[PDB]
Amino acid sequence: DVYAQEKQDFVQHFSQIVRVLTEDEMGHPEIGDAIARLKEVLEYNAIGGKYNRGLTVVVAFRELVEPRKQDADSLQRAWTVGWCVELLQAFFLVADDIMDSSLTRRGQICWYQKPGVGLDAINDANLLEACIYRLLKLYCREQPYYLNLIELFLQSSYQTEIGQTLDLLTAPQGNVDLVRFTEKRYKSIVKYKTAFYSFYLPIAAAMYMAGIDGEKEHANAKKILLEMGEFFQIQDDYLDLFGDPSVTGKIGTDIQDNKCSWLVVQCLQRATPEQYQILKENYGQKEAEKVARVKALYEELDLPAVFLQYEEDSYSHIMALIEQYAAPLPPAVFLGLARKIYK
Amino acid sequence: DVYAQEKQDFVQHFSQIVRVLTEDEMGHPEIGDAIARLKEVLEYNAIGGKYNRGLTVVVAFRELVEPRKQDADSLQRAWTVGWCVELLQAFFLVADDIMDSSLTRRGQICWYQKPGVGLDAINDANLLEACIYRLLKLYCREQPYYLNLIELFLQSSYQTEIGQTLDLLTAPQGNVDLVRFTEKRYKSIVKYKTAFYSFYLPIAAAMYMAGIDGEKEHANAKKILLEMGEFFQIQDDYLDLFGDPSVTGKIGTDIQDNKCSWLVVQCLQRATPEQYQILKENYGQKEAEKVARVKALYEELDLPAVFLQYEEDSYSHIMALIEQYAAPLPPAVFLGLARKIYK
Ligand SMILES: O=P(O)(O)C(Nc1cncc(-c2ccc(OC3CC3)cc2)c1)P(=O)(O)O
Ligand SMILES: O=P(O)(O)C(Nc1cncc(-c2ccc(OC3CC3)cc2)c1)P(=O)(O)O
Ligand SMILES: [Mg+2]
Ligand SMILES: [Mg+2]
Ligand SMILES: [Mg+2]
Ligand SMILES: [Mg+2]
Ligand SMILES: [Mg+2]
Ligand SMILES: [Mg+2]
Structure with a gap:
């Protein structure tokens, strides 16, 4: 590997x-x-x-x-x-941990929850961002790709922040959001909030470093990588509820936080009018037994089996796109990345 | 004007x-x-x-x-x-309004305090930052100063965030910080957190646009502009307590927030051991009557008169620096800016 x-x-x-x-x-x-x-x-x-x-x-x-x-x-x-x-x-x-009211990340307490940190973490976060540009300058200032990389990192932040904005707007706290949780909306959110930075960005950086700066080459890569990133976020949504926390390193909050999760979108597609009411009365609230009712509803509609089916289909799809759009790049670039995220 | x-x-x-x-x-x-x-x-x-x-x-x-x-x-x-x-x-x-627990800014309720905003304002803030780089790209991408401007805005963010970090470290909540409130520390904080972006940045942007990119010219400007920015922050600290809120547009929190304000530094320089105790028992706390005791102590040491004296001296100093370091730039560049901030 x-x-x-x-x-x-x-x-x-x-x-x-x-x-x-x-x-x-x-x-x-x-x-x-x-x-x-x-x-x-x-x-x-x-x-x-x-x-x-x-x-x-x-x-x-x-x-x-x-x-x-x-x-x-x-x-x-x-x-x-x-x-x-x-x-x-x-x-x-x-x-994101501050905004999602999160507890743990990567198996330890979230930085903002540490005693003595709190909302100072906002400045901490932005220092992390500033570090990127200081490293690019210190290490790549004299390279012909310097400006491409700066503009790629900035553009990727902007896209991600636009994604986040849609994520938040679609999930207002203390309000029944079910009408807004659609597939079309879901796919937009995840494209912008996750797919650009998690999948396009790193391969694109390496392309630029290797002097591959052509519009078509970037656009071809991106067709592969944005679909992979969409699957990645759906898997992240599934694991938020059904993953094992000693593996994921974090506790899921999507139901409490009223999120347009892949799960809730799948749920809405399948629920009887009665089940729609259960979801409505229980989604987006802090109460542990309400969360549990939602999870039971998801299990009652075999959403875990639906996720397993979708993962196999998405894997076939991504592979088909690698066949269509990888050249002239080595297909191993994309295949090694798919191996890391499927199963 | x-x-x-x-x-x-x-x-x-x-x-x-x-x-x-x-x-x-x-x-x-x-x-x-x-x-x-x-x-x-x-x-x-x-x-x-x-x-x-x-x-x-x-x-x-x-x-x-x-x-x-x-x-x-x-x-x-x-x-x-x-x-x-x-x-x-x-x-x-x-x-900053989120981190300083602020109430109003520019005469209206802080963005994060609006119902329905809250900590989503963190993402809102970062979108504002992203907008800078989108405008630079859309309007200046083909100009020979494009990269200078990008690097100036990034570097200015980094310096400002380093400043903020020192501001926060010097003011931990719920802890007696008086030992740390020194002049040397104060001047560092304000240089980084305010002076670079509020004074160097805008003149430097215009220098770069006019094709003045020399190291010495930038360094000369900066000697003027960082001193002006230090005075600007001292005035901002003074106005935090003694300014009229219908003019400043905001309510001051420096005493409650345990801040290394110019005022508290001046206070420490002047207080008797007894007054030092009053400050100690009352600084950095939420309670309105504690805040009031501090303010009374400051008035008892004629800090407003000390500020008025300092403003006249600083004005003479800045002018002397304009005499020493302005050329070859028009002195009107710096003078028009000093007119805007003194009195
Ligand atoms: O790791 P997580 O499960 O918490 C995922 N985290 C994640 C995924 N994609 C983008 C972000 C993100 C990026 C920037 C953000 O705001 C900062 C720009 C200001 C907030 C969230 C965060 P999500 O909350 O979307 O399920
Ligand atoms: O306008 P204010 O009186 O509130 C001043 N505000 C101010 C002055 N100089 C720098 C900042 C600033 C910049 C960035 C900050 O954090 C964001 C980078 C993440 C926080 C504060 C804020 P201060 O709180 O220092 O008296
Ligand atoms: Mg999250
Ligand atoms: Mg999130
Ligand atoms: Mg998640
Ligand atoms: Mg402030
Ligand atoms: Mg502040
Ligand atoms: Mg202030």
């Missing part, structure tokens, strides 16, 4: 990331304390996930750059850009 | 800003609702201030570009970059 090959080296590069985001400022002692808080934020929030998004940059970089061109410094730029994707994820999750 | 001259035109340009941040996406109807929320965020949070930071870009642009070079399109790029500074301010204040 090519991801598992490259993991140790990727993670080991983190202490260099952190040294450089501190060595950058030994000329300014007055900001010493702030830099120490930054280190602590990086350590708590950039570590402990699966690193799939960041590793995708590195794996794809290997497969796209001719190996005589993979010198020490280029590899280091690749690992650094991979870490920039992980920093963007860390930015997003720290903020 | 050159600021007052250019104001009407600046403000009128806002509806174009908003049209372009919406016309940009008529090819993507699925995100329609999100774009409507964006418009609403822009309207509530980018409007109602004094526009000094954004206007500084435009005023400075006029004074630095030779007028035969001030065509219709260049002016429009100037007003747009001015609006990018105002968007950055709007980003910062929306987030």
